From a paper:
AtzC is a tetramer, according to PISA, our SEC data (native molecular mass of ~210 kDa), and previous reports, with the asymmetric unit containing half of the tetrameric structure. The active sites of the independently solved structures show similar architectures, each having three histidine residues coordinated to the zinc ion (His60, His62, His217; 2.1 to 2.3 Å) as well as Asp303 (about 2.4 Å) and a water (2.0 to 2.1 Å) bound to the zinc.
The malonate (a poor inhibitor of AtzC) adopts a planar conformation in the structure and packs against Trp309 (less than 3.5 Å away) as well as interacting with Lys65, Gln160, His219 and Asn304 (2.8–2.9 Å, ~3.2 Å, 2.6–2.7 Å and 2.5 to 3.0 Å, respectively).
Author numbering:
A (entry chain A): 3 to 403
B (entry chain B): 2 to 403
Write the structure that this text describes.
Amino acid sequence: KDFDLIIRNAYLSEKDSVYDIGIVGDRIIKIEAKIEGTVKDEIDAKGNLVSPGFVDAHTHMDKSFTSTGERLPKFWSRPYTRDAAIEDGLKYYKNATHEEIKRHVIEHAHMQVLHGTLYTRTHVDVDSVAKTKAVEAVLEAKEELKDLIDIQVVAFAQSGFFVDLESESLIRKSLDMGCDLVGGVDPATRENNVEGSLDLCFKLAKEYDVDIDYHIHDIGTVGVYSINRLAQKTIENGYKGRVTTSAAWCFADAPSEWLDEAIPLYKDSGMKFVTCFSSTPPTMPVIKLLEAGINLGCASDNIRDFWVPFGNGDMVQGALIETQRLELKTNRDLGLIWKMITSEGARVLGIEKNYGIEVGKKADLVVLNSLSPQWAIIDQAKRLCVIKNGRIIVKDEVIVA
Amino acid sequence: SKDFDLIIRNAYLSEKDSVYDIGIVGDRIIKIEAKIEGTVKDEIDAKGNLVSPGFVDAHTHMDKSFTSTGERLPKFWSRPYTRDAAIEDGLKYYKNATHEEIKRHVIEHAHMQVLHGTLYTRTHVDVDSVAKTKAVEAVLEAKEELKDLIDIQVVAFAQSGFFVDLESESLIRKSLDMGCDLVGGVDPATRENNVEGSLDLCFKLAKEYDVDIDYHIHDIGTVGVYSINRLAQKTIENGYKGRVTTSAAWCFADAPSEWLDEAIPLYKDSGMKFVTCFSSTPPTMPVIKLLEAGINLGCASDNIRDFWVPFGNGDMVQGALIETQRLELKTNRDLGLIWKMITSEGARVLGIEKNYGIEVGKKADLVVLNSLSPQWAIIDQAKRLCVIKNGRIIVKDEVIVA
Ligand SMILES: [Cl-]
Ligand SMILES: [Cl-]
Ligand SMILES: [Zn+2]
Ligand SMILES: [Zn+2]
């Protein structure tokens, strides 16, 4: 047979036209207006958009779905604060079992792939109560999920290196077990030590030769200062391109000149950013960052836990949410959000060379039931088909792997 | 003696916080009991999930909906939104639009709404020197054909402005004579350039036909609040307490909070009602604060897939999620207030509250959801299982079966 799989009549946004896509093994081999040749399996996209797999660049798979089980979501009789949610986590992880955490990770991943997400980066709580229990469960589930979704795992010091003093050794072990990145939280308002927390993070990252993903939620000028120190140390440590800042809410309320001043530093350091659609501030300068050529991905953040009650693991839904948070309507702007859930995310994850609907790239694709990125955001139609490693894994809302 | 025309089994009801069977005869709820003895022909098992009254989309523009559709990309959206440019696109559209095209759009809009469990809506219809009464005629006609699916109130809406399009006054009078249910205008300040005159004219017309009022006030900041204050004061002077709605009211987001604090007693004294549309609700809109003060605040789609708003699925449960995200809400209490906005607050805006709710004696207009509670429905966005209007099943598993 000439192709293992052909997708017929696929509208491709980057080319602005309709094409047949021919696939062999896990690779795209041919993209032509009409493909002749024999073929084992076919999918007709019927003139609708086919897209690369969506990238959910920031999740917490380990503690997901912990709000579920009752008539009302658990934990949400009281308002959100970072420190209270940290406490709920310590209480939860005290009695949580390896199998419960694993089941949550798998459930999370299944929900993501049903919505066309084929790549994700998850953080995992590492602290003196969870120890490496969560890491173990996540790494194990990651192995079992290889044929559905690619997962990068961040060893994440949720309590703070200088607040939970067991964090440093537990993170080292976590990275020794095979976590892919390392990260901390709020060098200023959580750690009370910007220089020390950041320096420690880089030391650990260099010991295991891993990339960095840091949670910086601190608002205003203290947030921007924290990210500036991060970016400066990124350069000093020879880590250009290897560092991600997650959240960065501070760009919304810090004076705009602080961001204007910092952009060249972020470009020089190759700083990457992820904004999560469960918290992106309505005045976040998302479009401005993209127009400046800053690499900005998008993400679910927490799903149905003591941090965020919401979540469907659906990046197309997240795109709609972002348009509404940021008050966007033009085709251009909706197109930039679509980039955020696709090619920007790929770039954050470091997989851009293998990402996209181009000959030679990975056959990880989503056939949608809408005509274009803009219409898919607007109409929220369910995914028709999902393809991973050139194999069909989702058809009409069902996992068929 | 006679037996139920319809029973819904195992219905979780939010106001009672328990699971009940619901028995229906004709268009009315007759019995709500833990177990209704005996079987009937037409039954629906809710399987322990939430059953809710029909959702209220308290503000739509059915007449010009879906005009953005037809191509690979949405039409009209190569340029950013401004009120005045969208007014121009409308005048251009209505020049060549046919009675049948407008009607088809209205029906398509309504079908999309009922598929998502909306059983009551208030739509505005452009009345101006280009549309004339063509849109009104089409909407009133479609409204008659849709009675078994959805209740529609129709606002004769002077979109161009009474003092900008001078043919508006006479066209509105005929529109109301044809049977529109309410009258309204737009932006007394920045569109009409005449706050006293536009408002006084609107009340004169409203009194001539004994209809209620729904005014679009999109003007931001203190000019918006001033406009609404004048509206509320004239509401009292004209003996129209309870008969006036202010749509949008974006100005409450950016006007100083002490302006809203000062105005609240006036709004209560006038019985002013408000609608915020989830396609534009400003992120700092004091939604919770208005509700906690006992102000009546409903929710709505606004435009769907046109030259004003490209978005829209006519789905109030989706709108609820959008509002939680716009306003940064997470607590069960706050999500519960948003659910009130898409149900009982909307009913109150529309004036149907005496017949609205899952209570014995009320209208059997209901939605069976695939989620456990208002909060979980907002979060998980599951499709509607069943929709019931006038005690008859009209939607089953994403299909209109009426
Ligand atoms: Cl410091
Ligand atoms: Cl005036
Ligand atoms: Zn996070
Ligand atoms: Zn409107």
